[PDB]
């Protein structure tokens, strides 16, 4: 009941609809703390086998702390604009370097592992304690001091309790202090769920985020922030989905050319506005780089930093490309090469020249042969399409597709006065150039 598709023969493009939106509009920052110990070199000049292992595990811990201390020391995608991804978390850490902000956090978390702390600038952030190495080292490892270990399971327990810090240090070291995909070492799944549960958002947003934690991880940041006194702190910057559950639709385009027998003398045309389209508030967000949108079943996650704001009239380009309300963007060329585009529920085949183009399924083999021009085939009884030397697999999603017939628009142009090398043109701009060229030729 969800996904449908339509192919337009006039323009050689297809539209997929039936998807739902989840657009990241803002950021949410939280502070994660780890309590450290102040172990100083002990004498304990033993020779036991377990003492040596304990010493090695303490050396690893101290080297990790030193390394962390050293870490902090004093088409159409060209129209988008550039932002700064981690500005908010960096601002939070810039605040945390102030005089009493670490003390405030330390004194507000001693009784509980979660709390809301008001910073000196008035902003209140979630602070959450994930690991307590101070307690296990000060007590139960240096009892008031275990200089001759009598149990082997002490070594194993200490090794288990130390892996988290080493893994975090490694991840921060190989990334210069900023890890885009937030690993389960930085935040476990239970901790991430507990953190989502405390955001001041609606229950619908919480349900959307709780069922897609793998996307939330993929769209998050972790920033190494500070390590002073006996506290390790880093900021986690989570996505905020301000717009959810609105209709979304994808556009696929392929070149459209004439089919003259002579090798040259052929003109081509292509729509350049392929991408994802979602309507949020009385307008449409357009994402030219469809690689920047994650898809889970019929839910699309897109980032507004990589979008343009367009009027709702843009949708008229699919129904009629010559409408006066909106000017559709195209590209003209003179090189006709065969290729294929795999859509949501089928494939578009532009087969030109002397290439051999076919569609097949596993049981019966070839079940269609394509002629020169642009054509479409549904995935209902087709498994693969082969264009020249290339073989493609079609998606096997369930849905209905519709074929719309019409005369290709490249036949309405006169090749004599047709512009060719136009990368960033449109319908009106091509018409103006054609009109000027045609009006010039009236000499007498």
């Amino acid at each position: 009941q969800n996904i449908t598709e339509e192919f337009y023969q006039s323009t050689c493009s297809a539209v997929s609809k039936g998807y739902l939106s989840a657009l990241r509009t803002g950021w949410y920052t939280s502070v994660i703390t780890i309590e450290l110990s102040n172990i100083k070199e002990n004498k304990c000049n033993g020779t036991d086998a377990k003492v040596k292992l304990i010493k090695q595990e303490l050396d690893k811990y101290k080297n990790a702390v030193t390394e962390l201390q050293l870490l902090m020391q004093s088409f159409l995608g060209f129209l988008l604009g550039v932002g700064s991804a981690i500005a908010s978390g960096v601002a939070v850490c810039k605040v945390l370097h102030l005089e009493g902000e670490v003390n405030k956090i330390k004194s507000a978390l001693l009784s509980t592992n979660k709390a809301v702390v008001s910073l000196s600038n008035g902003v209140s952030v979630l602070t959450f304690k994930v690991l307590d190495l101070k307690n296990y080292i000060d007590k139960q490892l240096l009892p008031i001091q275990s200089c001759s270990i009598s149990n082997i399971e002490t070594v194993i327990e200490f090794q288990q309790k130390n892996n988290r810090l080493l893994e975090i240090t490694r991840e921060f070291s190989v990334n210069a202090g900023v890890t885009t995909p937030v690993s389960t070492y930085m935040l476990t799944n239970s901790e991430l769920l507990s953190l989502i549960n405390d955001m001041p958002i609606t229950n619908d947003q919480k349900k959307l985020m709780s069922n897609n934690v793998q996307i939330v991880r993929q769209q998050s940041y972790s920033i190494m922030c500070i390590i002073k006194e006996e506290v390790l702190a880093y900021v986690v910057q989570l996505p905020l989905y301000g717009v959810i559950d609105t209709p979304c639709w994808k556009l696929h385009t392929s070149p459209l050319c004439t089919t003259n027998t002579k090798e040259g003398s052929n003109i081509c045309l292509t729509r350049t506005d392929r991408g994802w389209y979602c309507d949020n508030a009385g307008s449409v967000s357009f994402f030219p780089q469809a690689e920047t949108c994650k898809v889970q079943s019929n839910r699309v996650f897109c980032d507004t930093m990589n979008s343009l704001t367009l009027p709702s009239e843009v949708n008229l380009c699919n129904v009629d490309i010559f409408n006066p309300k909106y000017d559709c963007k195209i590209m003209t060329s003179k090189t006709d090469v065969s290729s294929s585009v795999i859509t949501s529920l089928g494939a578009i085949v532009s087969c030109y020249g002397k290439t051999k183009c076919t569609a097949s399924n596993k049981n019966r083999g070839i079940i269609k042969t394509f002629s020169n021009g642009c054509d479409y085939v549904s995935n209902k009884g087709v498994d693969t399409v082969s264009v020249g030397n290339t073989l493609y697999y079609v998606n096997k999603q369930e849905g209905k597709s519709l074929y719309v017939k019409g005369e290709p628009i490249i036949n309405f142009y006169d090749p004599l006065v047709f512009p060719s090398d136009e990368f960033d043109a449109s319908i009106s701009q091509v018409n103006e150039k054609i009109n000027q060229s045609l009006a010039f030729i009236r000499k007498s």
Epitope: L20, N203, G242, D245, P247, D279, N280, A281
Partner: antibody, heavy 122, light 111 residues
């Protein structure tokens, strides 16, 4: 100009059924969450039910769970409330309202309808 | 989980300044959810007076202002007139009860 027009109110006996409707115009109906709010005669306001732009998430008040059902039709720009097993305390004026929000903390109802009175009397 | 409380009634004299208060708990206003105010006339429908704790839509005569802090919010009216006799509501969001509304405060002007 944005307009929300409610209809379908009337008298009914306890344990009966009724269906109210609200037709909107002046904005994209499919980009917004919609709500139902009722007010008893001489009493305060009470939120009833909400529905997201594509029917994915639905919420009810604890006093109407299991008896009311919210739905919408995006093609006709209308949303519906089906009331079943009516009780005496369901007498009130029912409003349809559009959701406004800032993404994180603020959520309010800026545009309201005119209301439709529903009376449950034996 | 929580509830929102409002003074049943308030009175004032023309030209004076009255204050309406809204008191929440740790699940509505202690959970960082904003407060919003609505004005209702004797036979009309509610209309928005203040959103975002302090914001005013286009058409409110700038005589209404609100503020929030902790689990308390207030609406202040200066220059009381005879057209201000109306019911006033505060609404927020709750973790368990979702959208919640105050009890309602009816303003009276003496004279």
């Amino acid at each position: 100009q944005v307009q929300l027009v409610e209809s379908g109110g009337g008298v009914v006996k306890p344990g009966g059924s009724l269906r109210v409707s609200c037709v909107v115009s002046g904005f994209t109906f499919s980009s917004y969450r919609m709500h139902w709010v009722r007010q008893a005669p001489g009493k305060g306001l009470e939120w009833v039910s909400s529905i997201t732009a594509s029917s994915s998430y639905i919420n009810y008040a604890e006093s109407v769970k299991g008896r009311f059902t919210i739905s919408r039709d995006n093609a006709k720009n209308s949303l519906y409330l089906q009331m079943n097993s009516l009780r005496a305390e369901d007498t009130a004026v029912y409003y349809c309202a559009r959701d406004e929000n800032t993404g994180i903390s603020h959520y309010w109802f800026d545009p309201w309808g005119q209301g439709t009175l529903v009376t449950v009397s034996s | 989980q929580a509830v929102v409380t409002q003074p049943p009634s308030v009175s004032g004299a023309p030209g004076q300044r009255v204050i309406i208060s809204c008191t929440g708990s740790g699940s509505n206003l202690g959970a960082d959810y904003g407060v919003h105010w609505y004005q209702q006339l004797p036979g009309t429908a509610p209309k928005l007076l203040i959103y975002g704790d302090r914001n005013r839509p286009s058409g409110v005569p700038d005589r209404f202002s609100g503020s929030k802090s902790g689990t308390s919010a207030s609406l202040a009216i200066t220059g009381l007139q005879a057209e201000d006799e109306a019911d006033y509501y505060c609404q927020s969001y709750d973790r368990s009860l979702n959208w919640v509304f105050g009890g309602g405060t009816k303003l009276t002007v003496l004279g």
